[PDB]
Amino acid sequence: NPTRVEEIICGLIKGGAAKLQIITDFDMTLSRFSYKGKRCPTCHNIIDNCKLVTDECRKKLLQLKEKYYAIEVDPVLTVEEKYPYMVEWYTKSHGLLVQQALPKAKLKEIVAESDVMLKEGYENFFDKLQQHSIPVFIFSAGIGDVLEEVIRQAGVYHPNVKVVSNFMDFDETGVLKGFKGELIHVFNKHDGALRNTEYFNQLKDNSNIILLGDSQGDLRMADGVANVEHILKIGYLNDRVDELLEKYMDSYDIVLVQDESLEVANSILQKIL
Amino acid sequence: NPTRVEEIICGLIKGGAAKLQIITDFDMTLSRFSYKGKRCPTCHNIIDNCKLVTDECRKKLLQLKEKYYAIEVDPVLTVEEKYPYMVEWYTKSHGLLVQQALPKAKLKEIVAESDVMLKEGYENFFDKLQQHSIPVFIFSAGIGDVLEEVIRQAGVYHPNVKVVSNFMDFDETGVLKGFKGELIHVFNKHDGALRNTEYFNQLKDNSNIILLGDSQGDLRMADGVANVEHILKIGYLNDRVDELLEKYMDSYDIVLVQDESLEVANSILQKIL
């Protein structure tokens, strides 16, 4: 309902800066799905395609993706069933990334020479948020170290920005040995939300939330919010559109089909802050 | 291969206007997939959503689409298996369109008040083609009468443009009674190509072809070309991208991901004509 969306937004404007927080996915949400007719990379792709991975290993990674992607988007399987494969997919990809002995010191170059792109309007998004000290919480199934190099290098890793993702584990050599903590993946966002309760409890007054995601899963990202008064959910639908449009209109308050900007979010921010 | 693509294009430039013809799909190929965050309509949607269809019938049409779309994009079914359902899908939708008794005289309004959009660069595409009398052959699984009202009203139904689609059959009242000829649908483009042999035989000298499509099926659109010397195949990949990207890079010479313009085609035309 367009009426309901306005009731929410009016709540947000009434709250102003003092009551607002942002929860958002990263890949295909803050970064672009495609550009100039070309598919843009996800954090995983940045590494898969970089010069520190061999042709042979890149080929094994692609086979993984073709097998496991097809299960991810299987119409017959429940998420129950899909869950162990999503887990398998990450353990193997990660498995292969370990073997290449990726050097921490190389991340900065890897990201700098990749095709990665933030959506139109991102400086304005991030700056406007920093200038009002609005807490921003980025919850991604991607790779924390890459994610951070994208935003650092774009000049928008401000102090209000908290990043929570799958971070790389290095050894003494400063060479990748695995992944820290519990795996974030598309199917368990809810567990990841409640696993970050300590951050959210420090934000009790921030009871007006804008959530930005790109999948159905992302709808759970606010499951650990302490005090919810008003929440606006904005959904980027970049792929599997005809299949998922109804479901998205059904659950996100705003569905933006193949939209490579943050202009809708920026105009809503303009009214609040 | 980028080298191979250039060999082809060089053939096309050498041929110039005198040897060129264009074969192209319409929906999501000349028309837009989405706009300003909103999914644009196909020729079928224009009718489904117009004021001459009831709320109730529009609801039955949507159920059809949700059932039959899911079969169309089933990974397990062969096209063999899917083929009778695609046929069923059209017969029922058409079936329901008949019942509403759609008036021929109303098409002009229906199209004029719909959200339909051609890609950026379309006037330049169509004009440049008309000005060199380049035969253009539009082969669509949509609805001929709608397709024609979109292009007529956009001021680009020029005499070099031949339209071949599923055209509406009216009765004495000028009220829809069915569909003429054999059904064009996504799976039988090849049969439709050879069924239009008479048009292609009149174009024997036009042995340089540019083909524009949006599906795998569309690759068969040139199957009835009399004399093939050079052919460039341009593919719009608007949906199911991650699933289909490899297959598309595999078979179209140029794959343009979520690209709502004709700029690539227009620059290739600039070099040829």
User: Is A74 one of the annotated active-site residues of the chain?
Assistant: no
Cβ contact, residue pair A37, B245, below 8 Å: no
b/e string for A53-85 if b means 16 or more Cβ within 10 A?
Answer: beeeeeebbeebbeebeebbbeeeeeeeebeeb
Measured CA to CA, the distance from residue B223 to residue B219 in angstroms comes to 8
Measured CA to CA, the distance from residue A214 to residue B203 in angstroms comes to 48
Breaks in chain A after residues (C–N exceeding 2.5 Å) = none
Partner B contacted by A245 (CB < 8 A): yes
Measured CA to CA, the distance from residue B137 to residue B206 in angstroms comes to 12
Residue in chain B closest to A237 (alpha carbons) equals B37
Question: What residues form DSSP beta bridges with A254?
Answer: A234
Rg (CA), chain B: 19
Partner B contacted by A249 (CB < 8 A): no
How many A/B residue pairs have CB atoms within 8 Å?
65
Measured CA to CA, the distance from residue B8 to residue A120 in angstroms comes to 35
Annotated binding-site ranges of B: 25, 27, 72, 93, 140-141, 189, 214
User: Does an H or E element contain A230, and which?
Assistant: strand A230-237
Q: How was this structure determined?
A: X-ray
In CATH terms, B32-116 corresponds, of 3.40.50.720, 3.30.450.40, 1.10.150.340, 1.20.1630.10, to 1.10.150.340
* Nearest neighbour of A37 by CB, restricted to B66, B70, B256: B256
* First-last CA distance in chain B: 25
Q: Is A25 annotated as a binding residue?
A: yes
Chain A residues whose beta carbon lies within 8 Å of the beta carbon of residue B74 = 75
Q: Is A27 annotated as a binding residue?
A: yes
Q: How many CB atoms lie within 10 A of CB A50?
A: 20
Partner A contacted by B250 (CB < 8 A): no
Q: What are phi and psi of B12, to 5 degrees?
A: -55, -50
Q: Residues, chain A, total?
A: 273
Under 8 Å between Cβ of B165 and B182: no
Cβ contact, residue pair B259, A73, below 8 Å: no
Chain A residues whose beta carbon lies within 8 Å of the beta carbon of residue B69 = 242-243
Q: What one-character-per-residue DSSP string does A107-135 give?
A: HHHHHHTS---BPBTHHHHHHHHHTTT--
| Encoded amino acid at A162, one letter | K
Cβ contact, residue pair A258, B69, below 8 Å: no
* First-last CA distance in chain A: 25
Residue B33 tokens, joined: 């997939």
Under 8 Å between Cβ of B197 and B115: no
Measured CA to CA, the distance from residue A69 to residue A54 in angstroms comes to 22
Positive or negative, the Cα torsion across B120, B124, B127, B129? negative
Residue B7 tokens, joined: 């060999």
User: Is B259 one of the annotated active-site residues of the chain?
Assistant: no
Cβ contact, residue pair A243, B38, below 8 Å: no
Residue in chain A closest to B242 (alpha carbons) equals A239
Q: What one-character-per-residue DSSP string does chain B give?
A: -HHHHHHHHHHHHHH-GGGEEEEE--TTTTB-SEETTEEPPPHHHHHHTSTTS-HHHHHHHHHHHHHHHHHHT-SSS-HHHHHHHHHHHHHHHHHHHHHTT-BGGGHHHHHHTS---BPBTHHHHHHHHHTTT--EEEEEEEEHHHHHHHHHHHT---TTEEEEEEPEEE-TTSBEEEE-SSPP-TT-HHHHHHTTHHHHHTTTT--EEEEEESSSGGGGTTTT-S--SEEEEEEEE-SSHHHHHHHHHTTSSEEEET--B-HHHHHHHHHH-
| Encoded amino acid at A49, one letter | N
Chain A residues whose beta carbon lies within 8 Å of the beta carbon of residue B29 = none
Positive or negative, the Cα torsion across B198, B204, B206, B212? positive
b/e string for B238-254 if b means 16 or more Cβ within 10 A?
Answer: bbbbbbbeeebeeebbb
Domain A32-116 in the same topology as domain A1-31+117-273 = no
Q: How many CB atoms lie within 10 A of CB B198?
A: 8
Which one-letter DSSP state was computed for residue A235?
E
Residue A151 tokens, joined: 């935003």
All residues at 6 or more sequence positions from A72 whose CB lies less than 8 Å from its CB, including other chains: A82, A85, A86, A89, A186
Extents of the domains making up chain B: 1-31+117-273, 32-116
Partner A contacted by B63 (CB < 8 A): no
Which one-letter DSSP state was computed for residue A252?
S
Residue in chain B closest to A260 (alpha carbons) equals B37
* Nearest neighbour of B242 by CB, restricted to A36, A69, A245: A69
Burial class (CB in 10 A: 0-12, 13-18, 19+), A6: exposed
**Closest among A33, A94, A43 to A237, alpha carbons compared:** A33
Chain A residues whose beta carbon lies within 8 Å of the beta carbon of residue B70 = 75, 243
Torsion-angle region of A117 (φ positive above 0: left; ψ -120 to 50: alpha; else: beta)? beta
Q: Detail the DSSP E strand segments found in A84-198.
A: 136-143, 161-166, 168-170, 176-179
Of the CA atoms within 13 Å of residue A17, those in its CB half-sphere come to: 10
Q: What is the CATH number of domain B1-31+117-273?
A: 3.40.50.1000
Partner A contacted by B33 (CB < 8 A): yes
Positive or negative, the Cα torsion across A12, A18, A19, A21? positive
Burial class (CB in 10 A: 0-12, 13-18, 19+), A137: buried
CA distance B34 to chain A (A): 7
All residues at 6 or more sequence positions from A80 whose CB lies less than 8 Å from its CB, including other chains: none
Measured CA to CA, the distance from residue B94 to residue B166 in angstroms comes to 10
Cβ contact, residue pair A243, B37, below 8 Å: no
Residue A196 tokens, joined: 């970050």
Q: Is A93 annotated as a binding residue?
A: yes
Resolution (A): 2.7
In chain A, % helix, strand, coil (3-state, to 5) comes to 45, 20, 35
Q: Hunting for tokens 């190099």 — which residue is that?
A: A149
